[PDB]
């Protein structure tokens, strides 16, 4: 009856009914904004470049879009949080 799509496998995050997020690409440089539209994901590129400041720590890079204020958070190592100020792994 009701109706909530788009999820996320690769960032590892859901999002309902009409949301947004981004999906970077690969070797290109672009990434692509995909806004949920009834479980059609309307994605599209778009150039970008990095985050005025590093909202990733622990070696995350954060990456902002160049006309939105859309931004994903990258952190390696495997920490937890965006900042990735929990560490589990290490002491």
Known sequence: ??????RDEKTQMIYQQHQSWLRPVL???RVEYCW????????HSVPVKSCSEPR???GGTCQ???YFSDFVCQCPEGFAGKSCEIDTRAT
């Not at 009856?1 to 788009?6: G, N």
């Not at 949920?36 to 994605?43: E, F, I, L, P």
Request: proline share 0%.
């Open 1 to 6: 009856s009701y109706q909530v799509i788009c």
């Open 27 to 29: 070797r290109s440089n």
């Open 64 to 66: 902002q879009a160049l």
């Open 56 to 58: 990733c720590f622990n």
């Open 36 to 43: 949920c539209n009834s479980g059609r994901a309307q994605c």
